[PDB]
């Protein structure tokens, strides 16, 4: 969907699979502010939205 009507998806109860995120070579703008970008498997947030 275009940005005028931005679409969302909340991730349900599943085991987080984040090791393939920082290892992907297609990404070139993996900059963000918040938790450390390396302790992704040690995070226990209640709900996550995309």
């Amino acid at each position: 969907a275009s940005v005028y009507a931005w679409n969302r998806k909340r991730i349900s109860n599943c085991v987080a699979d984040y090791s393939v995120l920082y290892n992907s070579a297609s990404f070139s703008t993996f900059k963000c502010y918040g938790v450390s970008p390396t302790k992704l498997n040690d995070l226990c947030f209640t709900n996550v939205y995309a």
């Binding site: 969302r8 998806k9 909340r10 349900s12």
Partner: protein
């Protein structure tokens, strides 16, 4: 979210909705996300 509850207890009234008490337990919750306005039933 789509929540579904059901009891399925026997009764003795057919003429109308029976008078009694029975709690309803959840069955399954579906995290889909959709705007809804109407619905229909299928026999």
């Amino acid at each position: 979210y789509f929540k579904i509850y059901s009891k399925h207890t026997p009764i003795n009234l057919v003429r109308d909705l029976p008078q009694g008490f029975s709690a309803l337990e959840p069955l399954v919750d579906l995290p889909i996300g959709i705007n809804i306005t109407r619905f229909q039933t299928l026999l």
